[PDB]
Amino acid sequence: QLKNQIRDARKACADATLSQITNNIDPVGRIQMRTRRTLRGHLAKIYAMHWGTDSRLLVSASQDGKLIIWDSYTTNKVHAIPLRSSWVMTCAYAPSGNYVACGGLDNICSIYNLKTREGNVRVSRELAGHTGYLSCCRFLDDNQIVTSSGDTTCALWDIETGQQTTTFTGHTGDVMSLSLAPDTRLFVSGACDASAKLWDVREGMCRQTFTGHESDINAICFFPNGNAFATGSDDATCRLFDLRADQELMTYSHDNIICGITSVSFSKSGRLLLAGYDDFNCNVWDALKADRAGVLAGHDNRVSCLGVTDDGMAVATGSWDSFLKIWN
Amino acid sequence: TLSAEDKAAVERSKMIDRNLREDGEKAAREVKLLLLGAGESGKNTIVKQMKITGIVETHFTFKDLHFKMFDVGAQRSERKKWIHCFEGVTAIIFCVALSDYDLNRMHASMKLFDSICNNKWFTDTSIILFLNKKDLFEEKIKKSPLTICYPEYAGSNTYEEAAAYIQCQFEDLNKRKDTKEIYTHFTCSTDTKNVQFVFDAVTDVIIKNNLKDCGLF
């Protein structure tokens, strides 16, 4: 019954589309980013990557049993960490840069200590308790981490204790992606039930549910100001939702795009929305007008992960091609 | 790379590359198999005789060949969202219990076989089909007819006819016979038989892949 009430409220608050309001601003124009660095050394399909807050180091996890830490400026490998399970499907980089985390078809999340006095990266802790593959993980502090899994639930962990302080439930299917708010007080998750939910980390309960996708949501990203996020699903469209309005603002789709999105990211100012595709291309979108500003066509197999530096200087794109390209 | 410690970093990177290449060479010499089948299909005995909380990895060596078997059936999560991780496995091992007339359960096994075999990732991957628990199946067929599972089965209620019928129903599910082959084995108690069948199937797969590469297949 309340579904009708929610739909009625949403239609009541819907007066003008984002496209019409943004018709008054000039277009971005052609965005011709060129590959500045090609990070090679992974011998299998790359499934996730993450930038360091210094906007110079980045970690990439692949299914060859290794996740490597690169010096993006010089392409040097700072670390190469062997994994007990080679089915890593995600990776993360602590805001302080001290730790990294990863997980996969083994339902545990492994946290690695990069600053060990012994000079080698050690497994700080293994977080177990999920009953499905780990889809995503994101650090809040050096002691807290939030993870999502095909268990259809997300959980907040106390790394020191090793137990999940809070468990987030409500998804009807595998949770495929997750994104922390800029202040790390809220996060959103995309699941295979074609819905996204906004969670209160402190309270541990869902705030809002966003629908509109026709297939599993593979990727999700927060708009830089923290009041909106963009989802990318298998129906070959990205979508932008606003938390305050609890509504869809704009969808980013094109007729000749017939494959699903695997990744989503925003530029520092939020004007450009970048999304990876199974068409082994990344399409840059004018976030305000839905126009495709450019295409980062440099990969062969599939773009499975991409991210923009906190500095806004560059965007890296990993792929099943086993290479990461840095565009600027 | 023009300072004292910006050159040591490059040397460290070169050493890391060396180790990565060595590990990749080491891991390319291991045959990778995907093990599938329902919980009651007898996968447990198969794994036990091979070796004698999500994915379970099993390593075993038979006649100079290293096998890695990935038992994925432990997790209930959606299959289409991680099955592509196993693209490139040499072969798929599918376990079926011939005594599956209880729940039928044979129908579920057939649906799973059809789903896996005709997957777009496994277009070229062959399947090593194991039809386990033939003894209890022989007790059951005497006790109950196969018509309880296959009403269209007009043949006699004997081991040979029913087993051949089951094999034909399973091998008829692959829509790309021109690309892949199915190796069907009625699992025997002798442990060596199953590992020998796996070795034979994998050897034939490798030989036929080489023949395809040479343009002779």
Epitope: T74, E118 | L2, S3, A4, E5, D6, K7, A8, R12
Partner: single-chain antibody, 228 residues
Framework: QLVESGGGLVQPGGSRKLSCSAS????????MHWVRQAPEKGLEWVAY????????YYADTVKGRFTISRDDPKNTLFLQMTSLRSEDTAMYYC??????????????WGQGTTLTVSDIVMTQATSSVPVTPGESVSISCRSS???????????LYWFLQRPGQSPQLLIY???NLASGVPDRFSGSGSGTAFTLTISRLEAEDVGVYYC?????????FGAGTKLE
């Protein structure tokens, strides 16, 4: 921890093998240095061997006479010394050093072993600086050549050698503070002139402060400024 052995009385023109047993860390990943110190003089870098032994460097005053090698399986570092002169008499330290973006070379120093045979010039302004606890002190240094590299890193290092103890890294690359160093110490400077500032000095800060450049391979040290 690093433990060194092999020193003692030596006749001139002889030979001696100094060894360092490394335990408690991944010896194979660290590049290792030998740093010596005459009985009453400052530190002098001797030789360097990288991880995997791919790169070896020697001081101009030891090249050809001194040989450095590793035993990674046994985690032991060696220094073969031949045709030892009288000037070779010095305490020899083995210094841990790992190079990657953001690392802190020279972080851990061994306890040293005494041997007794019976270039960017860097100058430190003052030799002795009387002080009492609670005061703020500044140690000054100067280099003949600019230590600022094209990549922005100023390769200056500060080491504190308390009386009767081996040197411990204080600051690396002129700004960064080594792990475990009290927040009292702060490093600053630019180009060819640098300073080390100690705020609310305590009794444990008494010692000799040595400056070192890591811009080029000879790894020159300063004369050393004493606080007392």
């Amino acid at each position: 921890q690093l433990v060194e052995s092999g020193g003692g009385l030596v006749q001139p023109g002889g030979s001696r093998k100094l060894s360092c047993s490394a335990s408690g860390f991944a010896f194979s990943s660290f590049g290792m240095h030998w740093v010596r110190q005459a009985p009453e003089k400052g530190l002098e870098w001797v030789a360097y061997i990288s991880s995997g032994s791919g790169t070896i460097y020697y001081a101009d005053t030891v090249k050809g006479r001194f040989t450095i090698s590793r035993d990674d399986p046994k985690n032991t570092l060696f220094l073969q010394m031949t045709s030892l002169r009288s000037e070779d008499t010095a305490m020899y330290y083995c210094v841990r050093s790992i190079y990657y973006y953001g690392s802190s070379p020279f972080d851990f120093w061994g306890q040293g072993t005494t041997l007794t045979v019976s270039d960017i010039v860097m100058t430190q302004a003052t030799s002795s600086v009387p002080v009492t606890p609670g005061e703020s002190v500044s140690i000054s240094c100067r280099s003949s050549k600019s230590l600022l590299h094209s990549n922005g890193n100023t390769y200056l290092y500060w080491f504190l050698q308390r009386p009767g103890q081996s040197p411990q890294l204080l600051i690396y690359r002129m700004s960064n503070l080594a792990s475990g160093v009290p927040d009292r110490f702060s490093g600053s400077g630019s180009g060819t002139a640098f300073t080390l500032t100690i705020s609310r000095l305590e009794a444990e800060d008494v010692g000799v402060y040595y400056c070192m450049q890591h811009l080029e391979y000879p790894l020159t040290f300063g004369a050393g400024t004493k606080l007392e």
